[PDB]
Amino acid sequence: ASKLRAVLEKLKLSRDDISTAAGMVKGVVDHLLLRLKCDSAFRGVGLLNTEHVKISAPNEFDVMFKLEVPRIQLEEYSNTRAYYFVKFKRNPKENPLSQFLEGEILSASKMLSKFRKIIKEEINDIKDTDVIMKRKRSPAVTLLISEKISVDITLALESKSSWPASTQEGLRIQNWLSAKVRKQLRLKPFYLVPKHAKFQEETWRLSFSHIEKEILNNHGKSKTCCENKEEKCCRKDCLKLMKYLLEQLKERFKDKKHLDKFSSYHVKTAFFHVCTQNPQDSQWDRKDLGLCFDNCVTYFLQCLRTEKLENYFIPEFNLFSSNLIDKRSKEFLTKQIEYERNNEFPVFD
Ligand SMILES: Cn1ccc(-c2ccc(Cl)c(CNc3nc4[nH]c(Cc5ccccc5)cc(=O)n4n3)c2)n1
Ligand SMILES: [Zn+2]
């Protein structure tokens, strides 16, 4: 309760502390977009959220470029619910992405190659800052700025049509944020990013990287949640502590492999499931931070032990299935978390 608050305070002070890092990243990114926009395949390219995956690493940034693709035809791959072939409707007004077609199918490989190549050409043009490009270890392109700051650049396709049918029963926020809000969010665009399941096929994965911010900024059942003193909730703090718990555990055991397949979006997913289960703001009273954090831990442990964690958008996709993460890894993380809970969370210090 008091220990958790102190953890949150030290995290806050490093975030809010004076840093030239964001200015250096923006300068590099703005150069790239100008270079990409001159190219025929990428003239519509722009920034998605005009981010930090690790709270413990303030020099590591995550950036997403988006490209609008109108009249897109999506074909689900092998019933995976999340992976799709990208085809183009027969509306030929010269498609800018034709050079990436392999048949009727849009090739992620060929598109990333030319994105990669154009970026590489603008890197070796900038003289002010030293920018170093790493070699395709997806997640698309990783840059190194002044040997301290690192940026992962992801290329996403953007569609403004209705979300695919696999999402129909997801985003189960009706009893928490309202049916009206669920409708508003589902009018936003959706995104597609490269990579396949399990030979390599040219499939894209659905991406909803823009939804979390929308929820977190308007997260209460009450419209006035966290706008006054009588309605302060701990939802954002609990999510931060879950993300930091996993980070610290991945760092403690980084020389082993048992935690390599877990990442923040697993924690995000399980957190927002607890928000669905506990929709009222009184279930998230600031005074109950330690107890609320415990709900979240307990639910995440239940997910590990049962090997069931539904994607928040595509509920039939089990993030914790045997084919994606094996029993041994889930059993290892369970033991570490259970040890943390029973020892007043050592990792935080
Ligand atoms: C990064 N990765 C690697 C593989 C996948 C992935 C796997 C299966 C599916 Cl079925 C999908 C479907 N798409 C998808 N699912 C999420 N879940 C959240 C987390 C979240 C939860 C609740 C509210 C807000 C955010 C973030 C995000 O961007 N997405 N995108 C994505 N993702
Ligand atoms: Zn609140």
Swiss-Prot record:
Q: Which residues bind Zn(2+)?
A: H219, C225, C226, C233
Q: Looking at the record's lineage, which domain of life comes first?
A: Eukaryota
Changing K12R: what effect? Strongly decreased ubiquitination by RNF185
Task: Pinpoint the site Important for preferential detection of curved long DNA.
Answer: K26, L34
Annotated phenotype, changing K236A: Abolishes enzyme activity. Abolishes stimulation of interferon production. Abolishes DNA-binding but does not affect translocation to the nucleus following treatment with etoposide
Consequence of substituting K243Q: Acetylation-mimetic mutant; reduced enzyme activity
Q: Which cysteines are joined by disulfide bonds?
A: none
Return the protein name.
Cyclic GMP-AMP synthase
